[PDB]
Enzyme design. Structure first.
Site, PDB file in Angstrom:
ATOM      1  N   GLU A   1      65.852  29.557  52.368  1.00 33.06           N
ATOM      2  CA  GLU A   1      64.440  29.928  52.488  1.00 33.06           C
ATOM      3  C   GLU A   1      63.884  29.939  53.905  1.00 33.06           C
ATOM      4  O   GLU A   1      62.875  30.604  54.154  1.00 33.06           O
ATOM      5  CB  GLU A   1      63.559  29.020  51.630  1.00 33.06           C
ATOM      6  CG  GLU A   1      63.854  29.088  50.136  1.00 33.06           C
ATOM      7  CD  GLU A   1      63.485  30.420  49.482  1.00 33.06           C
ATOM      8  OE1 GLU A   1      62.833  31.276  50.124  1.00 33.06           O
ATOM      9  OE2 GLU A   1      63.843  30.604  48.299  1.00 33.06           O
TER      10      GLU A   1
ATOM     11  N   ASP B   1      57.495  37.214  51.806  1.00 31.38           N
ATOM     12  CA  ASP B   1      58.863  36.933  51.389  1.00 31.38           C
ATOM     13  C   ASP B   1      59.651  38.240  51.211  1.00 31.38           C
ATOM     14  O   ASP B   1      59.159  39.330  51.539  1.00 31.38           O
ATOM     15  CB  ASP B   1      58.891  36.029  50.135  1.00 31.38           C
ATOM     16  CG  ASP B   1      58.394  36.727  48.866  1.00 31.38           C
ATOM     17  OD1 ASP B   1      58.221  37.962  48.859  1.00 31.38           O
ATOM     18  OD2 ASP B   1      58.180  36.026  47.853  1.00 31.38           O
TER      19      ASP B   1
ATOM     20  N   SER C   1      75.250  35.072  31.518  1.00 25.72           N
ATOM     21  CA  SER C   1      75.751  34.213  32.601  1.00 25.72           C
ATOM     22  C   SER C   1      75.624  32.742  32.217  1.00 25.72           C
ATOM     23  O   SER C   1      76.531  31.937  32.460  1.00 25.72           O
ATOM     24  CB  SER C   1      74.980  34.441  33.906  1.00 25.72           C
ATOM     25  OG  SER C   1      75.005  35.800  34.306  1.00 25.72           O
TER      26      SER C   1
ATOM     27  N   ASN D   1      79.640  37.906  36.260  1.00 22.83           N
ATOM     28  CA  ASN D   1      78.463  38.302  35.501  1.00 22.83           C
ATOM     29  C   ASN D   1      77.175  38.115  36.312  1.00 22.83           C
ATOM     30  O   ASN D   1      76.266  38.945  36.245  1.00 22.83           O
ATOM     31  CB  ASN D   1      78.406  37.554  34.160  1.00 22.83           C
ATOM     32  CG  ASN D   1      77.349  38.105  33.230  1.00 22.83           C
ATOM     33  OD1 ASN D   1      76.241  37.583  33.162  1.00 22.83           O
ATOM     34  ND2 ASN D   1      77.670  39.201  32.538  1.00 22.83           N
TER      35      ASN D   1
HETATM   36  C1  LIG Z   1      69.102  25.856  34.174  1.00 20.47           C
HETATM   37  C2  LIG Z   1      70.040  26.890  34.776  1.00 20.47           C
HETATM   38  C3  LIG Z   1      71.417  26.718  34.660  1.00 20.47           C
HETATM   39  C4  LIG Z   1      72.282  27.656  35.220  1.00 20.47           C
HETATM   40  C5  LIG Z   1      71.754  28.762  35.884  1.00 20.47           C
HETATM   41  C6  LIG Z   1      70.373  28.935  35.988  1.00 20.47           C
HETATM   42  C7  LIG Z   1      69.788  30.151  36.704  1.00 20.47           C
HETATM   43  N1  LIG Z   1      69.950  31.347  35.856  1.00 20.47           N
HETATM   44  N2  LIG Z   1      71.143  31.705  35.464  1.00 20.47           N
HETATM   45  N3  LIG Z   1      72.333  32.028  35.086  1.00 20.47           N
HETATM   46  C8  LIG Z   1      69.510  27.995  35.433  1.00 20.47           C
END
Ligand SMILES: Cc1cccc(CN=[N+]=[N-])c1
EC number: 3.2.1.17
Length: 162
Positions: free
Chosen positions: A11, A20, A117, A132
């Site tokens: 950041e 941003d 994912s 993914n």
């Molecule tokens: C709580 C959490 C666990 C793993 C990944 C993410 C972000 N989003 N994705 N994939 C959030």
């Protein structure tokens, strides 16, 4: 390395209001002020967040204060989200930091499309999850940051951040 150092790298630190990567008014260590195109509106949000009339400028201590609040709130949110909590809880601490990083950047709504994912991460199918994760607006718009975060999920190490 830890989540604070990781997000500080991703950041940056700026003490004056800036836009941003999405063109939104921001200050400090990625503290999003508002999605409004109005600079006056952003300045009001800033003054409200800091508790004084800042005129659009803050100190390093003030930036770090907002940052700690933003990181803490991101974690607390994850734990309150029925979709995200189980995946987060399934992870080791290094990969939890990668998760916090994504939610910090995009919010809980920003990761709504990451269902597949998330499943792969819960399954600890790390290379598949990494593939993914890159099939995303996120990766295309911020590829260098996304590559670092994805490497962190893939490996469970801090190699991408030195
Ligand atoms: C709580 C959490 C666990 C793993 C990944 C993410 C972000 N989003 N994705 N994939 C959030």
């Amino acid at each position: 390395m830890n989540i604070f150092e990781m997000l500080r790298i991703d950041e940056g630190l700026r003490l004056k209001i800036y836009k941003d990567t999405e063109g939104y008014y921001t200050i400090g260590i990625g503290h999003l002020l508002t999605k409004s195109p109005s600079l006056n509106a952003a300045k009001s949000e800033l003054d409200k967040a800091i508790g004084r009339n800042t005129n659009g400028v803050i100190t390093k201590d003030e930036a770090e204060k907002l940052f700690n609040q933003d990181v803490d709130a991101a974690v607390r949110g994850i734990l309150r989200n029925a979709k995200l909590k189980p995946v987060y809880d399934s992870l080791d601490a290094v990969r939890r930091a990668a998760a916090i990083n994504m939610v910090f950047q995009m919010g809980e709504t920003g990761v709504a499309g990451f269902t597949n994912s998330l499943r792969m991460l819960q399954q600890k199918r790390w290379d598949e999850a990494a593939v993914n994760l890159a099939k995303s607006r996120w990766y295309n718009q911020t590829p260098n940051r996304a590559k670092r975060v994805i490497t962190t999920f893939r490996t469970g190490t801090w190699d991408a951040y030195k």
